[PDB]
């Protein structure tokens, strides 16, 4: 976790999925599933509705996660030219990546935090 994530207020979570309108007891298949909630605005989603894998779900539950609208660059601190890490869902401007990106990767992308550059 980044320092500026470890100390800040966490908004009250809204106990409904913004996607399916169900509670923790009813996802899209009407089965129970704990919500993930934005620490800034409190908006929630079922991990299944957010299309997160279980591994990502587990990682994000451990972090101060921001929803799509609240998301801020973890480098410079939304537009359409943000990248979201497929490991932690943090946002980074392409020009804020290390090294900087100029085109959308075809496949997966991971940030420096989840996989620091090989300093040999
Ligand atoms: Zn849902
Ligand atoms: Zn939010
Ligand atoms: Zn990451
Ligand atoms: Zn940035």
Numbering used by the authors: 193 to 269, 274 to 316
Give the published text.
The developmental regulator monocytic leukaemia zinc finger protein (MOZ) also known as (MYST3/KAT6A) is a MYST (Moz, Ybf, Sas, TIP60) family acetyltransferase that is required for self-renewal and differentiation of haematopoietic stem cells. In addition to the MOZ acetyltransferase domain (referred to as the MYST domain), the N-terminus of MOZ contains two tandem PHD fingers comprising the double PHD finger (DPF) domain. The structure of MOZ DPF shows the typical globular domain of a DPF with PHD1 and PHD2 each harbouring two zinc atoms coordinated by C4-H-C3 motifs in cross-brace topology. The structures combined with biochemical studies reveal how MOZ DPF manipulates the structure of the H3 tail to sample its modification status and promote its acetylation.
To understand the molecular basis of H3 recognition by MOZ and the consequences of H3K9 and H3K14 acetylation, we determined crystal structures spanning MOZ DPF (194–323) alone and in complex with a series of histone H3 peptides (1–21), unmodified or acetylated at H3K9 or H3K14 to 3.0 Å, 1.6 Å, 1.6 Å and 2.5 Å resolutions, respectively. In our structures, residues L194–D199 at the N-terminal boundary of PHD1 form a helix (denoted as α1) that folds back onto the DPF core and interacts with the PHD2 subdomain through salt bridge interactions between E197 and R286, hydrophobic contacts engaging L194 and I309 and interactions between the H196 and R269 side chains. Other interactions between the PHD1 and PHD2 subdomains are observed, including a hydrogen bond between W257 and D285. On H3 binding, subtle conformational changes in the DPF domain occur in regions of direct contact with H3, including a side chain rotation of F280 and changes in a linker region (designated L1), which harbours a helical turn in the H3 complex (A275-N277; labelled as α3a in Figure 2B) but not in the unbound DPF structure. The side chain of H3K4 inserts into a pocket on the surface of MOZ DPF that is partially occluded by residues from the L1 linker in the unbound DPF crystal structure.
